[PDB]
Design an enzyme around this catalytic site. Structure first.
Site, short mmCIF file in Angstrom:
data_model
loop_
_atom_site.label_atom_id
_atom_site.label_comp_id
_atom_site.label_asym_id
_atom_site.label_seq_id
_atom_site.Cartn_x
_atom_site.Cartn_y
_atom_site.Cartn_z
N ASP A 57 0.79 -1.00 0.00
CA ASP A 57 0.09 0.01 0.04
C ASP A 57 0.70 1.33 0.04
O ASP A 57 1.98 1.46 0.92
CB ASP A 57 -0.72 -0.02 1.15
CG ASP A 57 -1.86 1.23 1.01
OD1 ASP A 57 -1.51 2.44 1.55
OD2 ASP A 57 -3.01 1.08 0.49
N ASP A 138 -15.10 -14.85 14.09
CA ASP A 138 -15.13 -16.08 14.44
C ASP A 138 -14.62 -17.06 13.31
O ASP A 138 -13.99 -18.09 13.61
CB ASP A 138 -16.54 -16.57 14.92
CG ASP A 138 -17.72 -16.11 14.13
OD1 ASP A 138 -17.23 -15.39 13.03
OD2 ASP A 138 -18.77 -16.46 14.36
N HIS A 142 -11.64 -19.67 13.79
CA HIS A 142 -11.78 -20.68 13.53
C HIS A 142 -10.66 -21.52 12.45
O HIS A 142 -10.01 -22.69 12.74
CB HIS A 142 -13.23 -21.02 12.80
CG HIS A 142 -13.69 -22.32 12.30
ND1 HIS A 142 -13.04 -22.83 11.17
CD2 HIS A 142 -14.51 -23.26 12.66
CE1 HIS A 142 -13.60 -24.08 11.09
NE2 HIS A 142 -14.51 -24.13 11.94
N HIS A 146 -7.36 -24.51 13.39
CA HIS A 146 -7.05 -25.43 12.50
C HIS A 146 -5.71 -25.64 12.61
O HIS A 146 -5.03 -26.87 12.63
CB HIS A 146 -7.74 -25.50 11.27
CG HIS A 146 -8.84 -25.95 10.86
ND1 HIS A 146 -9.50 -27.03 11.67
CD2 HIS A 146 -9.94 -25.21 10.43
CE1 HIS A 146 -10.74 -27.31 11.52
NE2 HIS A 146 -11.11 -26.07 10.50
N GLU A 177 -13.91 -14.61 19.58
CA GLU A 177 -15.09 -13.62 19.48
C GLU A 177 -15.62 -12.99 20.70
O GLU A 177 -15.67 -11.74 20.89
CB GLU A 177 -16.47 -14.18 18.94
CG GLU A 177 -17.21 -13.13 18.29
CD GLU A 177 -18.51 -13.69 17.32
OE1 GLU A 177 -18.34 -14.32 16.29
OE2 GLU A 177 -19.58 -13.54 17.79
N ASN A 183 -19.64 -7.93 19.25
CA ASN A 183 -21.01 -8.33 19.47
C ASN A 183 -21.37 -9.87 19.40
O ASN A 183 -21.72 -10.46 18.59
CB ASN A 183 -21.92 -7.94 18.18
CG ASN A 183 -22.25 -6.74 18.05
OD1 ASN A 183 -21.87 -5.90 17.30
ND2 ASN A 183 -22.92 -5.98 19.22
N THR A 194 -24.89 -14.63 4.38
CA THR A 194 -26.48 -14.01 3.86
C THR A 194 -26.58 -12.29 4.30
O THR A 194 -27.42 -12.22 4.91
CB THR A 194 -27.41 -14.83 4.06
OG1 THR A 194 -27.20 -15.05 5.62
CG2 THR A 194 -27.12 -16.24 3.66
N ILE A 197 -30.16 -11.45 4.69
CA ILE A 197 -30.88 -12.05 5.72
C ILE A 197 -30.52 -11.79 7.05
O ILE A 197 -29.40 -12.04 7.50
CB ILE A 197 -31.06 -13.80 5.25
CG1 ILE A 197 -31.76 -13.97 4.10
CG2 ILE A 197 -31.69 -14.31 6.63
CD1 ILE A 197 -31.23 -15.37 3.50
N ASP A 226 -19.02 -34.70 3.33
CA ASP A 226 -18.29 -33.65 4.08
C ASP A 226 -17.47 -34.50 5.28
O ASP A 226 -17.41 -34.30 6.19
CB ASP A 226 -19.48 -33.05 4.94
CG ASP A 226 -19.04 -32.10 5.99
OD1 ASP A 226 -17.74 -31.45 5.58
OD2 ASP A 226 -19.42 -31.98 6.97
N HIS A 231 -18.69 -31.31 9.61
CA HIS A 231 -19.22 -30.08 9.85
C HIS A 231 -20.63 -30.13 10.26
O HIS A 231 -21.21 -29.09 10.47
CB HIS A 231 -19.19 -29.20 8.51
CG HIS A 231 -17.97 -28.74 7.95
ND1 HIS A 231 -17.29 -27.55 8.36
CD2 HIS A 231 -17.09 -29.16 7.02
CE1 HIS A 231 -16.11 -27.53 7.74
NE2 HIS A 231 -15.94 -28.49 6.83
#
Ligand SMILES: N[C@@H](CCCC[NH3+])C(=O)O
Ligand SMILES: CC(C)[C@H](N)C(=O)O
Ligand SMILES: [Ca+2]
Ligand SMILES: [Ca+2]
Ligand SMILES: [Ca+2]
Ligand SMILES: [Ca+2]
Ligand SMILES: [Zn+2]
Length: 316
Positions: A57, A138, A142, A146, A177, A183, A194, A197, A226, A231
């Site tokens: 940058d 999160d 996550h 791993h 988190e 929050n 989403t 939603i 999966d 999951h």
């Protein structure tokens, strides 16, 4: 790589401003020298070649829309580093201050993120199912988790072993988190899933069945998709962890919660001292029982609550 440590300012995927640690050498790079051997954030430039280019940058201000995913991958990697150091006395994922690398703008429209055995990788999402995935603290934690698992228990990514692997990533991603404390909740991926939603998420720890995941060993997925449901069956363990921390009665079994800090201590201990690549759910229960016993004693509430939580999800 070599330069002087600077502090830039930018805006993340959710629109908040934050400072980020950068390195100056002609350009300002997304290279944070303040944590271990460094946090390094790369631009994959919509391709799939990794890592891509160390993020450069010209002015140390990161307010362009293109900038936002990089800002959050870099920043949330720092937060996650801080959690592990301050809470668990763990220096980076390998415990020896390994450099933490993340690439953003991976592919085009990619609705996912991952740890590839060497670094974190974040899609931008297609803008309908997901917005850039590094926007979820999160999600970042996550994925970095791993890495922590790879260097410790090394849980094989298949069937029960792989569902524990996943749940450990959801557990610590959530505990991160809560640590950053913006929050926080017991859902996974809500900040980036989403847009348009309201109120949903990828997975729920508090009620896995909300999104089709089992909350009891009796409802475990035994098929082939999966990687044998890693999951999906993670729901069973996520629910146990939620109950240990928060308490509740589930299929008639009452669990007294012991709070997030102690959940973290128990599962970090389990992860780092007892679990193995091949551990199954029953082995997890005993690792968590031994860990709670080490930390709080044989007759503690904390041990009783681990047992009740696993009873509640049908894991003996
Ligand atoms: N991270 C999970 C869910 C992501 C959504 C899949 N597009 C997985 O890889 O299965
Ligand atoms: C999206 C993220 C949390 C992860 N790669 C799945 O699950
Ligand atoms: Ca700039
Ligand atoms: Ca949240
Ligand atoms: Ca969450
Ligand atoms: Ca949503
Ligand atoms: Zn995962």
């Amino acid at each position: 790589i070599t330069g002087t440590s600077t502090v830039g300012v930018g805006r993340g995927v959710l629109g908040d401003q934050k400072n980020i640690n950068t390195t100056y050498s002609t350009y300002y790079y997304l290279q944070d020298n303040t944590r271990g051997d460094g946090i390094f954030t790369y631009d994959a430039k919509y391709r799939t070649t990794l890592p891509g280019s160390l993020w450069a940058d010209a002015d140390n201000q990161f307010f362009a829309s293109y900038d936002a995913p990089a800002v959050d991958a870099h920043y949330y990697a720092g937060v996650t580093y801080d959690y592990y150091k301050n809470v668990h006395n763990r220096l980076s994922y390998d415990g020896n201050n390994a450099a933490i690398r993340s690439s953003v703008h991976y592919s085009q429209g990619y609705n996912n993120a991952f740890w590839n055995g060497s670094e974190m990788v974040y899609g931008d999402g297609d803008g309908q199912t997901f917005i850039p995935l590094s926007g979820g603290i999160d999600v970042v934690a996550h994925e970095l988790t791993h890495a922590v698992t790879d260097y410790t228990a090394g849980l094989i990514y298949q069937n029960e072993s792989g569902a524990i692997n996943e749940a450990i990533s959801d557990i610590f991603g959530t505990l991160v988190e809560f640590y950053a404390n913006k929050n926080p909740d017991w859902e996974i991926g809500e900040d980036v899933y989403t847009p348009g939603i309201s109120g949903d998420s990828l997975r729920s720890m508090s009620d896995p069945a909300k999104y089709g995941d089992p909350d009891h060993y009796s409802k475990r997925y035994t098929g082939t998709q999966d990687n044998g449901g890693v999951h999906i069956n993670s729901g069973i363990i996520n629910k146990a962890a939620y109950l240990i921390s928060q308490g509740g009665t589930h299929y008639g079994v009452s669990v007294v919660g012991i709070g997030r800090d102690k959940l973290g201590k128990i599962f970090y201990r389990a992860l780092t001292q007892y679990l193995t690549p091949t551990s199954n759910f029953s082995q997890l229960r005993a690792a968590a029982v031994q860990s709670a016993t080490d930390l709080y004693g044989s007759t503690s509430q904390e041990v009783a609550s681990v047992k009740q939580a696993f009873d509640a999800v049908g894991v003996k």
